Amino acid sequence: GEWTILERLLEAAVQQHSTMIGRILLTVVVIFRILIVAIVGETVYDDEQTMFVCNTLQPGCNQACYDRAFPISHIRYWVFQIIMVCTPSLCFITYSVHQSSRFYIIQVVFRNALEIGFLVGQYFLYGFSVPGLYECNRYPCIKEVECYVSRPTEKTVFLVFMFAVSGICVVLNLAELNHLG
Amino acid sequence: GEWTILERLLEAAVQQHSTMIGRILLTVVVIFRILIVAIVGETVYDDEQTMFVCNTLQPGCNQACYDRAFPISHIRYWVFQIIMVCTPSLCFITYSVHQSSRFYIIQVVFRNALEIGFLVGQYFLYGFSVPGLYECNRYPCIKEVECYVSRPTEKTVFLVFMFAVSGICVVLNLAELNHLG
Amino acid sequence: GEWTILERLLEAAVQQHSTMIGRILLTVVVIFRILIVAIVGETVYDDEQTMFVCNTLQPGCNQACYDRAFPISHIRYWVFQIIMVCTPSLCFITYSVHQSSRFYIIQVVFRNALEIGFLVGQYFLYGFSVPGLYECNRYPCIKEVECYVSRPTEKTVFLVFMFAVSGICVVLNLAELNHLG
Amino acid sequence: GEWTILERLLEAAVQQHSTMIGRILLTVVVIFRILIVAIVGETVYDDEQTMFVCNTLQPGCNQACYDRAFPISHIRYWVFQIIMVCTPSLCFITYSVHQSSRFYIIQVVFRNALEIGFLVGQYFLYGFSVPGLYECNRYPCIKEVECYVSRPTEKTVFLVFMFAVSGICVVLNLAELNHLG
Amino acid sequence: GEWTILERLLEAAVQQHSTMIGRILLTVVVIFRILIVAIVGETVYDDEQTMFVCNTLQPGCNQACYDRAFPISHIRYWVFQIIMVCTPSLCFITYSVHQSSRFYIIQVVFRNALEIGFLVGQYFLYGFSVPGLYECNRYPCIKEVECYVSRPTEKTVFLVFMFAVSGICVVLNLAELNHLG
Amino acid sequence: GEWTILERLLEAAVQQHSTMIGRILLTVVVIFRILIVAIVGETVYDDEQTMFVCNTLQPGCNQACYDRAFPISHIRYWVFQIIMVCTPSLCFITYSVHQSSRFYIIQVVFRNALEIGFLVGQYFLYGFSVPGLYECNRYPCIKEVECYVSRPTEKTVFLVFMFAVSGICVVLNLAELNHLG
Amino acid sequence: FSVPGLYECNRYPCIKEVECYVSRPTEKTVFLVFMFAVSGICVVLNLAELNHLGW
């Protein structure tokens, strides 16, 4: 994608007064999330469906079992999460032209709600690992079939790393929320 | 595509006096539509025809049934909609050099007409979900055949999200239209 | 391609004195032609020969029948037309450094000649629709064979849209030509 | 490729005093050569070897007959020609930083020699058309075999257009050479 | 990936007062690591799984044995290492807006810890060479099978070069750490 | 790759005082090496392993014989050579900030050593031509097999051109070394 | 009285109705008709004898 547009908007938006915890949080989001997804994460999930195979002769069972095993790709969930998390920080651009600290409070509250929601959704959607085998019982497949996954270790490492970074961003959001009191 | 040209034109065009609702609408357009289509939406629809299969031995039946099931791709409809919606806001560039509020009224009415037209067209073209099976009775296929779709859940999520964002932009356009009175 | 060079040249070239109709024409060419071809039109014609199939066992008949059915791709004809149409507006860069209204008249007449020529050539080359079947009687194919086309509806929509935009640009050129008298 | 580097160098290099014919020549080279090769010409020659087929069962005969039929691709010859033609105009940067009309004479002489050499080489390498059949008698192929070419009409059009543009640039070089006397 | 964002951040971050050894280290990291990974290293590891083959008829054994032989790709480990190593130098951006030599000491100690950790991890993960054969005894493969690797010499050269550059950066970090005393 | 970073660094680094021969050498390196590798050389070596075939039924013999015939690709050797040759000219950025002719002598000697080393290494690694046949006697292939190469003439032309340009750069380096005395 | 060249089948595991193609339909039709004729001849003769002896 064209990440430079988002980067220019973030550059125009970081001109808002912030505390120490808010700048530590912005450093973590810029380094550990955007630079890794935009460089490393795209190529891991490139041949996920080309390399996904099932032990069957049934036409259309590969598509059914891949859609049942991976309803949404990890990389697109992370890109959507990155875009949504920076929205409260991107509403400063709109609020500045109107004004030319209640907004700051609303931004902190909404950013905490978004971080916790995305972290819990990531826990329920995927879990903590990506296994190398899948058991599929959907149509048009006959009864139960077995399917095999591409790069299941390099995606488990990615899941664990992303979960750790999201937990760091949630703890920093709760620290700043406690600060405001 | 080269989204940077469109972004430069939008940057040159947002120098027009606007109300609160118009800037909330422009924030929603920039964030929830352009950044998602230009980063996330392209890769979902990349292997739509390579991964589309039918249960037959007839040459040319895959092409016929794919063109009957997906006459126009979702991503290209959304890109065209994004380009067309910003046209009233891009006519300010042309209207500025002549002058160096009737135009504002014309922009608002035309933008509402475009938003409602594209939303209704999206409802009639696609619907609310993308099923995982298709029934095809076109030539050169023999009587009725069954075909299978690639990533039918990650495109249903995309459809629902785009419909929600388009409904938000329509409600904001109607709010501003009521404001002008 | 690298559309940014063409866009920079167009930015440097629009510093010429123009009338109302000439700026309406430049708005139509910038919006409805360059932004659509450079973003939307490339991906439609990407797998045109990979997905083109014929009902035969003869080696080399796919290449022969694809070259007979699509002598020149639509997207390359449109890119060439876009480049050629902007040539009279790009000769201002060369004409400016010499001088540091006859040129304006020459630009208008040549731009009308180019627009009408390309529109008539588009009508004779392609027509108004792209059918989903083709009948081929060229070597090395045996007598008559039947071949099937990829995405024949999404290319008919593109043809009709491009024909409409070209007709709008021709009517505006004739309006300005009548204006000069 | 990264054409923007070459474009920046050409922008820095066109600050040299030039005559009318030299600027007409630079306009023709910028428009009819660089913009067409960098946008249109790359995609025509993309699947030249993937789509090239021969009527045989011999392993390695496709590679041998493709290398015998197309020793050097058209697009790479044109890119090399474009790079070499602009060299006398790119030595102005070095001459200017050294000096911080004999050079102009040397530039004109060398540019005429390069244009005529490349035009004659293009005539001897390729000719005027690209046929759709090839007859191959190289190893490991058995005696004579027949091979089929991909997109042989869209490459004949490209050859004729490039030959016409090169002839225009040669006539302008000879006009300016006669001007200097 | 979009290395230009990282390069802009590095440009903004090198405005910190540094010693001679720190600038020699930054020269080595900029030249021998970032420019080589961002240009050369991506294409070597592009067809690693497409070209990886095993001598079996068992579905899913290629995926299992490729994930067992290459748990994490070399290029992604190097990109992650490059990103992590520059973090202490990127925390200067955050520390500058707060301050507008203890930080310098913390940066040096953390950079030495990161360099030594990544070098030891590279030694334990991969070793010193990439063999051309692999012996695999994982499910679903029957007992022991043999698998063949793509480009095993051009990846051994890459491993040795990267190990040498990492050792140079570690020796320079230890030199500066001894300097501070 | 991202050649723009290297070009920006080269632009920042050419602000060093240089003689006539050093600027002729920099003109040759910028034109005949960087612009050709970054535009033309990548696409020639794109399908080298996809199009490389051997006359056998043994799994894994294609990988073994391709790695034995082409241990390192030509294009990556040339990119590495281009990066390494410009290192003495890129150490000026580090050496300038300390003062904010011994260095010039060190640069000249080191650049001569690098040029001669890379030229001799290119002679020993590859030679003067790329044949169209290869004889392979490595494991797992049975005794001796024959393999066929993709585009063996367009890579011989590239080898000869690169050898000529490298010889020109070596002669200019020896000219300047004799100049200094 | 005939063996057609095409057959339309809708039995599991087939998806809805499918078209199948028979080998040597004309020869099998010829054989069918000929055998019917021969069997008719034999039936006629046996009925003849039945009515000749039977009362």
Side-chain angles (χ1 to χ4, degrees):
Chain A
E2 282 300 346
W3 294 89
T4 43
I5 322 181
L6 171 87
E7 291 307 83
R8 236 176 314 281
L9 287 191
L10 260 181
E11 182 89 27
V14 285
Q15 279 226 54
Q16 186 194 40
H17 166 238
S18 183
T19 66
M20 180 182 61
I21 307 145
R23 288 187 287 261
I24 297 179
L25 179 59
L26 255 60
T27 308
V28 182
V29 308
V30 175
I31 301 179
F32 293 92
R33 285 186 173 183
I34 299 181
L35 287 182
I36 299 183
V37 174
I39 296 185
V40 183
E42 181 61 286
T43 323
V44 184
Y45 303 87
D46 193 19
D47 55 336
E48 43 182 348
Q49 196 175 187
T50 308
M51 281 289 160
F52 186 89
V53 72
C54 298
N55 194 331
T56 185
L57 277 180
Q58 181 72 24
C61 182
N62 289 258
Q63 286 81 2
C65 295
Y66 174 83
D67 189 64
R68 192 65 181 184
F70 303 101
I72 299 180
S73 185
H74 296 195
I75 188 66
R76 281 175 272 276
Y77 184 84
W78 292 328
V79 175
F80 182 80
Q81 174 183 1
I82 288 180
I83 292 182
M84 292 290 99
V85 160
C86 303
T87 298
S89 198
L90 292 178
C91 297
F92 176 78
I93 309 179
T94 305
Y95 183 90
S96 289
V97 303
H98 281 256
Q99 302 297 69
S100 159
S101 279
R102 186 177 182 180
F103 198 73
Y104 191 86
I105 301 295
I106 298 303
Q107 285 184 331
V108 168
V109 176
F110 267 98
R111 187 181 294 105
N112 297 32
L114 296 177
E115 294 273 10
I116 304 178
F118 280 105
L119 182 61
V120 176
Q122 180 180 351
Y123 169 78
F124 281 93
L125 273 177
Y126 309 115
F128 289 106
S129 70
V130 182
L133 303 176
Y134 186 70
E135 308 285 339
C136 186
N137 48 15
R138 195 208 248 181
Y139 184 85
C141 317
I142 312 265
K143 271 149 314 208
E144 187 176 359
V145 302
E146 191 175 14
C147 301
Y148 313 94
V149 190
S150 169
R151 303 176 191 258
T153 306
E154 201 176 4
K155 300 176 180 176
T156 306
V157 179
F158 239 104
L159 267 180
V160 175
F161 178 81
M162 283 299 176
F163 201 94
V165 170
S166 302
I168 297 191
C169 303
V170 177
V171 71
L172 298 180
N173 280 124
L174 291 178
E176 187 169 48
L177 187 67
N178 176 84
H179 176 68
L180 288 41
Chain B
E2 282 301 345
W3 295 87
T4 38
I5 324 165
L6 171 85
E7 292 306 82
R8 236 177 313 280
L9 287 191
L10 260 178
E11 180 257 0
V14 286
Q15 279 222 247
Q16 185 194 40
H17 166 238
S18 182
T19 66
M20 180 182 61
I21 306 145
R23 288 187 287 261
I24 297 179
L25 179 56
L26 255 60
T27 309
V28 180
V29 177
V30 175
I31 302 180
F32 293 92
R33 285 186 173 183
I34 299 181
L35 287 182
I36 299 183
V37 174
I39 296 185
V40 183
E42 181 61 283
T43 323
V44 184
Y45 302 88
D46 193 18
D47 55 336
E48 43 182 347
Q49 195 175 187
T50 304
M51 281 289 160
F52 185 89
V53 73
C54 299
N55 194 331
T56 185
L57 277 180
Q58 181 71 24
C61 182
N62 290 258
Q63 286 81 2
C65 295
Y66 175 83
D67 188 63
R68 192 65 181 184
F70 304 101
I72 300 180
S73 185
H74 296 195
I75 188 65
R76 281 175 272 276
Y77 183 84
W78 293 328
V79 175
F80 182 80
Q81 174 182 1
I82 288 179
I83 292 182
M84 289 294 102
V85 161
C86 299
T87 298
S89 183
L90 292 178
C91 299
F92 176 78
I93 309 179
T94 305
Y95 181 93
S96 285
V97 302
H98 283 245
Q99 305 298 75
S100 306
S101 279
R102 187 177 182 180
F103 197 73
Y104 191 86
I105 302 293
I106 297 304
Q107 285 184 331
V108 169
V109 289
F110 266 98
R111 187 181 294 106
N112 298 22
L114 296 177
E115 295 272 2
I116 304 179
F118 281 105
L119 183 61
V120 176
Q122 179 180 351
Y123 169 78
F124 281 94
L125 273 177
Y126 308 115
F128 289 106
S129 69
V130 182
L133 303 176
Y134 186 70
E135 308 285 338
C136 186
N137 48 15
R138 195 208 248 181
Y139 183 85
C141 317
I142 311 268
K143 271 149 314 208
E144 187 175 359
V145 302
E146 191 175 14
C147 301
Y148 313 94
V149 189
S150 172
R151 303 176 191 258
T153 306
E154 201 176 4
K155 300 177 180 176
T156 306
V157 179
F158 239 101
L159 267 180
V160 175
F161 179 81
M162 283 299 176
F163 201 94
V165 170
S166 303
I168 297 191
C169 303
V170 177
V171 71
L172 298 180
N173 280 124
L174 291 177
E176 189 169 39
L177 188 66
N178 176 84
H179 175 68
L180 288 41
Chain C
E2 291 291 357
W3 294 88
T4 38
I5 321 163
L6 171 86
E7 292 307 83
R8 236 176 313 280
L9 289 192
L10 261 183
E11 187 90 21
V14 290
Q15 279 227 55
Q16 187 194 42
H17 166 237
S18 184
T19 66
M20 180 182 61
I21 306 145
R23 288 187 288 261
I24 297 179
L25 179 56
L26 255 60
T27 308
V28 180
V29 308
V30 175
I31 301 179
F32 293 92
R33 285 186 173 183
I34 299 181
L35 286 183
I36 299 183
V37 174
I39 296 185
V40 183
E42 181 62 281
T43 323
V44 184
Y45 302 87
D46 194 12
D47 55 336
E48 43 182 347
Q49 195 175 187
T50 306
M51 281 289 160
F52 186 89
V53 72
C54 299
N55 194 331
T56 185
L57 276 180
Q58 181 72 24
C61 183
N62 289 258
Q63 286 81 2
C65 295
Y66 175 83
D67 189 63
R68 191 65 181 184
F70 303 101
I72 300 180
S73 185
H74 296 195
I75 188 65
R76 281 175 272 276
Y77 184 85
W78 293 328
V79 175
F80 182 81
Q81 174 182 1
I82 288 179
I83 292 182
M84 289 293 102
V85 160
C86 298
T87 298
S89 198
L90 292 178
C91 299
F92 176 78
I93 309 179
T94 305
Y95 180 93
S96 285
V97 302
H98 283 245
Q99 305 298 75
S100 307
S101 170
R102 187 177 182 180
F103 197 73
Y104 191 86
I105 301 282
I106 298 304
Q107 285 184 331
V108 168
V109 289
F110 266 98
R111 187 181 294 106
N112 294 36
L114 296 177
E115 295 274 355
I116 302 178
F118 281 105
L119 183 60
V120 176
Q122 179 180 350
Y123 169 78
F124 281 94
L125 273 177
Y126 309 116
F128 289 106
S129 70
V130 182
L133 303 176
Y134 186 70
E135 308 285 339
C136 186
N137 48 15
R138 195 208 248 181
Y139 184 85
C141 317
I142 311 269
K143 271 149 314 208
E144 187 175 359
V145 302
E146 191 175 14
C147 301
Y148 313 94
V149 189
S150 170
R151 303 176 191 258
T153 306
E154 201 176 4
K155 300 177 180 176
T156 306
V157 179
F158 239 101
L159 267 180
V160 175
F161 178 81
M162 283 299 176
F163 201 94
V165 170
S166 302
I168 297 190
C169 303
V170 177
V171 71
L172 297 180
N173 280 123
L174 293 177
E176 188 169 40
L177 188 67
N178 176 85
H179 176 68
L180 287 43
Chain D
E2 282 300 346
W3 294 88
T4 43
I5 321 181
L6 171 87
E7 291 307 83
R8 236 176 314 281
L9 287 191
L10 260 182
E11 182 89 27
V14 285
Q15 279 226 54
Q16 182 191 43
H17 166 238
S18 183
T19 66
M20 180 182 61
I21 306 145
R23 288 187 288 261
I24 297 179
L25 179 59
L26 255 60
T27 308
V28 181
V29 309
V30 175
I31 301 179
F32 293 92
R33 285 186 173 183
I34 299 181
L35 287 182
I36 299 183
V37 174
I39 296 185
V40 183
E42 181 61 286
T43 323
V44 184
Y45 303 87
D46 193 19
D47 55 336
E48 44 182 347
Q49 196 175 187
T50 308
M51 281 289 160
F52 185 89
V53 72
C54 298
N55 194 331
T56 185
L57 277 180
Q58 181 71 24
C61 182
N62 289 258
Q63 286 81 2
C65 295
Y66 174 83
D67 189 64
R68 192 65 181 184
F70 303 101
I72 300 181
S73 184
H74 296 195
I75 188 66
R76 280 175 272 276
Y77 183 85
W78 292 328
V79 175
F80 183 80
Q81 174 182 1
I82 288 180
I83 292 182
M84 293 289 101
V85 161
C86 304
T87 298
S89 199
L90 292 178
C91 297
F92 175 77
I93 310 179
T94 304
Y95 182 77
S96 290
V97 302
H98 208 66
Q99 301 291 60
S100 203
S101 170
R102 187 177 182 180
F103 198 73
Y104 191 86
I105 301 297
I106 298 303
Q107 285 185 331
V108 168
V109 176
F110 267 98
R111 187 181 294 105
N112 295 37
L114 296 177
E115 294 273 10
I116 304 178
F118 280 105
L119 183 60
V120 176
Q122 180 180 351
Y123 169 78
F124 281 94
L125 273 177
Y126 309 115
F128 289 106
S129 70
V130 182
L133 303 176
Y134 186 70
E135 308 285 338
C136 186
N137 48 15
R138 195 208 248 181
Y139 184 85
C141 317
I142 310 268
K143 271 149 314 208
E144 187 175 359
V145 302
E146 191 175 14
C147 301
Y148 313 94
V149 190
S150 170
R151 303 176 191 258
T153 306
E154 201 176 4
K155 300 177 180 176
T156 306
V157 179
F158 239 104
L159 267 180
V160 175
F161 178 82
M162 283 299 176
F163 201 94
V165 170
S166 302
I168 296 191
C169 303
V170 177
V171 71
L172 298 180
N173 280 124
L174 291 177
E176 187 169 47
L177 187 67
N178 176 84
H179 175 68
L180 287 41
Chain E
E2 292 283 8
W3 295 88
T4 38
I5 321 163
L6 171 86
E7 292 307 83
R8 236 176 314 280
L9 288 191
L10 261 182
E11 187 90 21
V14 290
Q15 279 227 55
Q16 186 194 41
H17 165 239
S18 184
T19 66
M20 181 183 60
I21 307 159
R23 288 186 288 261
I24 298 179
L25 179 56
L26 255 60
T27 308
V28 180
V29 309
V30 175
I31 301 179
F32 293 92
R33 285 186 173 183
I34 299 181
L35 286 183
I36 299 183
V37 174
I39 296 185
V40 183
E42 181 61 283
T43 323
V44 184
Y45 302 87
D46 194 12
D47 55 336
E48 43 182 347
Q49 195 175 187
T50 306
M51 281 289 160
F52 186 89
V53 72
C54 299
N55 194 331
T56 185
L57 276 180
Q58 181 71 24
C61 183
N62 289 258
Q63 286 81 2
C65 294
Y66 175 83
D67 189 64
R68 192 65 181 184
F70 304 101
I72 300 181
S73 184
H74 296 195
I75 188 66
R76 281 175 272 276
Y77 184 85
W78 293 329
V79 175
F80 182 81
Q81 174 182 1
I82 288 179
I83 292 182
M84 289 293 102
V85 161
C86 298
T87 298
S89 198
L90 293 178
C91 299
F92 176 78
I93 309 179
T94 305
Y95 185 89
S96 289
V97 303
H98 281 255
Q99 303 297 70
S100 158
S101 168
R102 187 177 182 180
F103 198 73
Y104 191 86
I105 301 282
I106 298 304
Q107 285 184 331
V108 168
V109 288
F110 266 98
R111 187 181 294 105
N112 294 36
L114 296 177
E115 295 274 10
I116 302 179
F118 281 105
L119 183 60
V120 176
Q122 179 179 351
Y123 169 78
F124 281 94
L125 273 177
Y126 309 116
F128 289 106
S129 70
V130 182
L133 303 176
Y134 185 70
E135 308 285 338
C136 186
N137 48 14
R138 195 208 248 181
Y139 183 85
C141 318
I142 311 268
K143 271 149 314 209
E144 188 175 359
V145 302
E146 191 175 14
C147 301
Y148 313 94
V149 189
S150 170
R151 303 176 191 258
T153 306
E154 201 176 4
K155 300 177 180 176
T156 306
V157 179
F158 239 102
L159 267 180
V160 175
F161 178 82
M162 283 299 176
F163 201 94
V165 170
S166 302
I168 297 191
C169 303
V170 177
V171 71
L172 297 180
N173 280 123
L174 293 177
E176 187 167 60
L177 188 66
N178 176 85
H179 175 68
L180 288 43
Chain F
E2 282 301 345
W3 296 86
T4 38
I5 325 165
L6 171 84
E7 292 306 82
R8 236 177 313 280
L9 288 191
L10 260 179
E11 180 257 0
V14 286
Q15 279 222 247
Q16 186 195 40
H17 166 238
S18 182
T19 66
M20 181 182 61
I21 307 145
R23 287 186 287 261
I24 297 178
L25 179 56
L26 256 60
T27 309
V28 181
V29 309
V30 175
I31 302 180
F32 293 92
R33 285 186 173 183
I34 299 181
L35 287 182
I36 299 183
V37 174
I39 296 185
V40 183
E42 181 61 283
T43 323
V44 184
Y45 302 87
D46 193 18
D47 55 335
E48 44 182 347
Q49 195 175 187
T50 304
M51 281 289 160
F52 186 89
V53 72
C54 298
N55 194 331
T56 185
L57 277 180
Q58 181 72 23
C61 182
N62 289 258
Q63 286 81 2
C65 295
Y66 175 83
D67 188 63
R68 192 65 181 184
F70 303 101
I72 300 181
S73 184
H74 296 195
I75 188 66
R76 281 175 272 276
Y77 184 85
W78 293 329
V79 175
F80 182 81
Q81 174 182 1
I82 288 179
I83 292 182
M84 289 294 102
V85 160
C86 299
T87 298
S89 183
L90 292 178
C91 299
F92 175 78
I93 309 179
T94 304
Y95 177 94
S96 69
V97 303
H98 284 244
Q99 296 64 342
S100 202
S101 164
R102 187 177 182 180
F103 197 73
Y104 192 86
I105 302 293
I106 297 304
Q107 285 184 331
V108 169
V109 289
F110 266 97
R111 188 181 295 105
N112 299 355
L114 296 177
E115 295 272 2
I116 304 179
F118 281 105
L119 182 60
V120 176
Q122 180 179 351
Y123 169 78
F124 281 94
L125 273 177
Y126 308 115
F128 289 106
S129 69
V130 182
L133 303 176
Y134 186 70
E135 308 285 338
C136 186
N137 48 15
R138 195 208 248 181
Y139 183 85
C141 317
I142 311 268
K143 271 149 314 208
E144 187 175 359
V145 302
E146 191 175 14
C147 301
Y148 313 94
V149 189
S150 172
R151 303 176 191 258
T153 306
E154 201 176 4
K155 300 177 180 176
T156 306
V157 179
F158 239 101
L159 267 180
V160 175
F161 179 81
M162 283 299 176
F163 201 94
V165 170
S166 302
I168 297 191
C169 303
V170 177
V171 71
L172 298 180
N173 280 124
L174 291 177
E176 189 169 48
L177 187 67
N178 176 85
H179 176 68
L180 288 42
Chain G
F1 287 117
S2 75
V3 176
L6 310 160
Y7 180 74
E8 300 138 28
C9 75
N10 70 312
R11 195 208 248 181
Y12 181 83
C14 316
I15 319 179
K16 271 149 314 208
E17 175 174 315
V18 154
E19 197 169 84
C20 303
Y21 309 97
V22 180
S23 98
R24 259 177 196 120
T26 307
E27 197 151 46
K28 289 166 179 163
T29 299
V30 172
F31 217 130
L32 252 181
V33 174
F34 163 79
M35 289 307 283
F36 201 86
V38 179
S39 294
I41 289 172
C42 266
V43 171
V44 160
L45 282 183
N46 297 129
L47 279 167
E49 285 214 41
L50 193 68
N51 214 356
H52 172 294
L53 281 85
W55 43 86

